[PDB]
Amino acid sequence: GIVRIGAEVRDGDILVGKVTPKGETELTPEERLLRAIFGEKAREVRDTSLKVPHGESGKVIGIRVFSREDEDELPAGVNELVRVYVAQKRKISDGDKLAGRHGNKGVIGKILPVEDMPFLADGTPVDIILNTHGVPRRMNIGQILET
Amino acid sequence: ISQRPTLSEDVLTDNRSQFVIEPLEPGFGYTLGNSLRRTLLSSIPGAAVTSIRIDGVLHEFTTVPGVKEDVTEIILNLKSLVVSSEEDEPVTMYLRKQGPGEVTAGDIVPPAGVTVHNPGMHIATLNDKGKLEVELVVERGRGYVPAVQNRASGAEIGRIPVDSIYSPVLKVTYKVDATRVEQRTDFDKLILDVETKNSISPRDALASAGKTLVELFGLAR
Amino acid sequence: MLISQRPTLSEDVLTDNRSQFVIEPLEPGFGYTLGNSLRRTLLSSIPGAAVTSIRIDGVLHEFTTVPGVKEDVTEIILNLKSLVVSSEEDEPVTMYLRKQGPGEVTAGDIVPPAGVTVHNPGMHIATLNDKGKLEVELVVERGRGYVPAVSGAEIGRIPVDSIYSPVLKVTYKVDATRVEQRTDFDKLILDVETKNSISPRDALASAGKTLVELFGLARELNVEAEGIEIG
Amino acid sequence: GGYDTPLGITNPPIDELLDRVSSKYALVIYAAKRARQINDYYNQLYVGPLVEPGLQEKPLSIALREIHADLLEHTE
Amino acid sequence: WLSAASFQETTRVLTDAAINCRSDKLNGLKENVIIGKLIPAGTGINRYRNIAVQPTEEARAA
Amino acid sequence: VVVAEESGVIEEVSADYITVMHDNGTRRTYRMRKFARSNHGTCANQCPIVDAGDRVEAGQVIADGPCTDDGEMALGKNLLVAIMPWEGHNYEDAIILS
Amino acid sequence: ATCYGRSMATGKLVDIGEAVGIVAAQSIGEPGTQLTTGGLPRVQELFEARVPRGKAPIADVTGRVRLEDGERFYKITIVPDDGGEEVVYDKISKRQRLRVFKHEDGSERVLSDGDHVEVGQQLMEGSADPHEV
Amino acid sequence: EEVIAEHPVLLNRAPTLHRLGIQAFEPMLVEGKAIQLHPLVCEAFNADFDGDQMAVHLPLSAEAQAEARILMLSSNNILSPASGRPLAMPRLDMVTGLYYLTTEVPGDTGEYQPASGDHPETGVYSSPAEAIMAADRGVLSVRAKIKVRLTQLRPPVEIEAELFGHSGWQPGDAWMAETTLGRVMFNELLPLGYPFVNKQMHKKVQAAIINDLAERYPMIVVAQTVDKLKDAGFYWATRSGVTV
Amino acid sequence: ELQGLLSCTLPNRDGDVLVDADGKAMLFDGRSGEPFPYPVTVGYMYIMK
Amino acid sequence: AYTLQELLTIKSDDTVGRVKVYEAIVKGENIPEPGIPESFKVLLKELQS
Ligand SMILES: [Mg+2]
């Protein structure tokens, strides 16, 4: 019931499946029908699986598991304990925060295609366009000298 | 006043050439050179690696025994691969290496129609205990496309999608010379400098750009 | 290399001499690629006829006041640069304008030689008071775009600014349209105001033909896969 | 009559709408109750829309266009 | 007293309100905010909040 | 960053570990934190910067950790910058990137 | 609405339901971060109607003034012109100057003993108590 | 995008110092994870882009949507409720742009000449379109003084009183103006029928023009004029050459 | 010393000095194509994520 | 006023109003009338304590 190493999990995918015993008063109307028509086992279970939170995605790069079956120490009343490690490669985006070393911070408002950037006489396009009106009033002229 | 424009090539290296277009209206050089530069940097067809499968790994964030680099660094090194394909269809190259040495792009066996233009490009360095075995899917496309996740494909787990930088042109600039005599005959001479990634010649890239631009401007009719 | 969703060219007719064309949808980046090129082509590549120089009677050294009329020299030069003329022969054809009666000299009072045409004969030109005599020469040439006044070598003749271009004012703007799932696609909007020599449709068609022939020079270097969108 | 064709949410100019009513709050409740009427009508098939709606026009936009056309009464 | 209890010195206000057996008439925007009632200002006053709207007959015909 | 505790010669170098044979005959091996999560979710990934034959001195950097390049704190990138407004996209401290 | 006047936001006469009290509180508080007795402390001193430090008393009634010069402290007595009795403002600070008010003859000058004083005239420089006003 | 159409949202930036700290906007879907904020509402929110965040609230009831579209709509609150001065006013970059656009440079390219000698006047143009054509070539500078025949712009008070008298100027009636092409392009942004402003656009003058447009014109026309000025000032700000 | 170094900047591969002794350069607008009217300070700045 | 009431009743703690709001939006019906904020009940219970 654990996700496989190397799986690319999306927003809401199941990482670890886990069921919980349910009382005979918590069942939904659609649940009582399926329990009564089939006469299933007394182990009525609710789905409490570990799912991916919103805004998360990536490859499962590692799994660690602890069980009472082994000598693994756990707190009182905890049978099994599983950790899944998810890695994501974040490229630079709109809204990401950049800063020099002179207190010149700002968020990315626009990523332009390489052909849109102002380019030097030999065709080399500039990489980052910093607005002029910031430099003189913030009293950090070193950022110009560093340039 | 009337004289049709003429395009003359002037090579500098095997993968860099200038192109002169002399009889253009005044003020008309910069915009034409810039349209050509946009098309060159944007929509020139090429080929690159789509996905890779390394034997003994399931994701990028791991190491291979005996290799000095990790899989992430190996993929960053493979980013510099220049390759050309005539198949226009997902094809597969292979790479196997054993024992001490330096795995370079020359160690790759491309199929028919696929050629690797920089055999000396460093990929990995292997020691006594090192063995590397990589499958590389090469596809033919244009522009830039980010790695296609295994949800949008029927791809199984071992497949490692990779960013594909399809553009084969390297650097494009232009320069106009404005002849504005005291008489009535003024004209700009455009000089477009094109450098490609050794996969195609500047002549072919400029030809593709010209075809794309002609097809586009044919709309106003 | 692959095929692209074919852009369409919609036209909206604001007035008879002014229109708005919409090319959409374009692949990201091609809006500004086609825009400045089409603008410069429309403005400075369509051939047309225009006034080059004038010789006004009664004044050859002064050039400030014309006796017998209400307007001065410079306003005459202004509203003569607005004259819409089209010629057939590529040679500097000369026309004459004369009037004696106290009234208004318009563009219908000009005697147009064979091969030239005045498209706005109702345009006001000058006002003659009582006993007002008006006699002016007009040189017409075929050129492209806009050329400033190039002279001397004979008194009385003054060069003017030759607005050869049959289009008058062109602007363009690139908006963001979405094909499907992609909100960054380009949409080009041209606004073209021309004379009454040719409609905006004909001006755009001529500019497109010119640019097709131009980039044909780059096409002629090889036959390589490129972006195809026909059909 | 010296403004360009409005876009989206400003489909009727706010000033022409403010002419029909005494103040802004009155117009707010005006359009809100008319939109509730329109939505009840759409749920039953009660007075239907007095102007041809757009393809998928929100009831509030329909109500605003109706108030702009002087098609509704109002008693404070 | 509900308005004053939420501003400052809640203990003193509540004690003096209990002793004086105060009764809040529940009229004032802050109190309506607390109890969840339309505040008596703006669109909440009875002038605008109670409006009869009905289409005309000339429009019901068209 | 990984630092040589004693002079010697690299006996073996892998993405996993770097082992150096000292001069007295003893060997020292340094394992590499590879794609390790930090307290704040950033990635601690060490890379060897020496090759199989190299002789290293005591105090020399053998591997580069996070935000390090050849032994120096490398917290950012050298970007080609032009100081100018650009169609109001860099307006009010915003930044435009190629 | 007519006593209030124009709505600053809308430019027209203020509407009915407008809660101009909150608008006023926000308009007074919003630029408060720019202020530097002092600055904002004086605003709080006034809005709370606290007895200001550096109090400058005012005159209770029209009368003749008698200001006794003292090195350490001043003292003032007023004899009313209406047939009244002496009012005593006393124990003034030597660190406080005297108000330069335009007397009845018209000439503005420093506070001169033995001259006419109107009602509510500020006796010294500084800030007056609004309760006394 | 179908259910988003004409359904306003509320944007808020803490600290909410005045009521303008919450404004209603029409949402348009944007690729990415960042809210796009109009550059003219930054004065009201005290918002910059040094890492600021904002909150989005979705009105559900018909009354709430009505209050958003009418009371709290962005383009309906242009003036400060505290002082009546404009807040949705061109700020630094747009200022710099329009200031550069309307400055007058003595001796610039294509500047007007007194026509002394056998050579007649040169800095005269039949229409602003001809001046645009001359600026396409290196012939005319945008900040160069010239004389133009204008047919779609209202002349100043004195000039309209002298050349047209009692009968007001009408769209189409031409007149001669001694200005720069930049000031012609600036006044093309202002509403049709506004008296021509032949000045160098300091921020004070822009504040004055918008104060007048508020005092006399409808709110929507002001909301459109400020957008036109925004676009113009952003275009001409990069081409002004302000660098450190 | 910094002002002095901007003068003897080595040229690019083609022998062109791209940055003058003021630290500015002539850039082209990759959108319209026309060059920007005035020189702009370009250089290399250390930017952090 | 109505926005303020909606924000403070059927978006925070009107335990029946929020479910009725979900039902009305899912069925295109008009948004119901606000109820009584549960926090006000809790305040009353704390004062009684
Ligand atoms: Mg901030």
Side-chain angles (χ1 to χ4, degrees), chain D residues 8-9 11 15 36 58 61, chain H residues 3 5-6 26 63 69 219:
Chain D
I9 240 176
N11 19 2
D15 311 69
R36 299 189 80 95
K58 305 297 166 59
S61 334
Chain H
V3 313
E6 290 182 343
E26 186 179 359
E63 302 87 358
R69 290 192 52 169
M219 188 76 65

Side-chain angles (χ1 to χ4, degrees), chain H residues 13 48 50 52:
Chain H
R13 198 208 95 103
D48 61 6
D50 68 326
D52 292 18

Side-chain angles (χ1 to χ4, degrees), chain C residues 2 4-54 56-69 71-88 90-129 131-133 135-179 181-225 227-228 230:
Chain C
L2 305 99
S4 175
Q5 176 167 330
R6 178 162 183 173
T8 72
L9 171 60
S10 321
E11 179 184 7
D12 194 314
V13 179
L14 305 182
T15 71
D16 284 332
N17 301 317
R18 165 110 166 262
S19 290
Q20 275 197 359
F21 302 95
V22 173
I23 307 180
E24 75 163 274
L26 301 180
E27 280 189 343
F30 278 112
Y32 294 91
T33 298
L34 313 186
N36 199 30
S37 286
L38 279 180
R39 184 181 182 274
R40 189 73 63 162
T41 310
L42 288 163
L43 282 178
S44 54
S45 290
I46 317 179
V51 186
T52 297
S53 58
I54 63 173
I56 299 178
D57 191 80
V59 42
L60 46 87
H61 266 133
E62 200 48 89
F63 295 146
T64 178
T65 304
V66 170
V69 304
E71 292 84 329
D72 63 76
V73 186
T74 63
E75 287 185 334
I76 290 303
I77 297 179
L78 290 184
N79 47 39
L80 283 185
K81 284 178 297 188
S82 307
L83 175 67
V84 183
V85 60
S86 51
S87 179
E88 271 74 283
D90 287 310
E91 284 180 352
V93 180
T94 56
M95 331 185 303
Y96 302 101
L97 169 58
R98 285 171 288 262
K99 193 176 177 184
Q100 274 273 13
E104 54 163 328
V105 191
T106 69
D109 307 331
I110 287 85
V111 182
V116 315
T117 311
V118 172
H119 301 265
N120 46 337
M123 174 188 60
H124 173 267
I125 290 186
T127 57
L128 290 173
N129 327 323
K131 306 173 61 63
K133 176 53 165 64
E135 177 182 45
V136 174
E137 182 198 1
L138 306 169
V139 183
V140 184
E141 288 197 43
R142 304 199 72 260
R144 293 170 185 169
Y146 172 96
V147 182
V150 183
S151 62
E154 184 52 40
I155 214 151
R157 185 180 183 175
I158 38 180
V160 299
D161 311 324
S162 300
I163 304 179
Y164 298 114
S165 180
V167 316
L168 235 55
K169 186 179 177 176
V170 179
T171 177
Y172 74 106
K173 194 167 305 174
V174 189
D175 277 8
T177 186
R178 178 248 322 173
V179 47
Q181 193 133 349
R182 287 276 270 255
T183 79
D184 73 320
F185 271 54
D186 283 12
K187 162 191 178 176
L188 179 60
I189 308 179
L190 283 166
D191 189 329
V192 285
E193 179 181 1
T194 67
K195 298 170 181 173
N196 34 28
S197 300
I198 57 177
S199 65
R201 197 179 304 101
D202 283 320
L204 189 62
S206 179
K209 179 195 306 300
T210 289
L211 290 181
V212 162
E213 292 174 304
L214 227 177
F215 296 107
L217 297 183
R219 175 88 177 108
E220 287 165 18
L221 285 168
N222 196 323
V223 175
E224 161 81 314
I228 306 181
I230 297 292

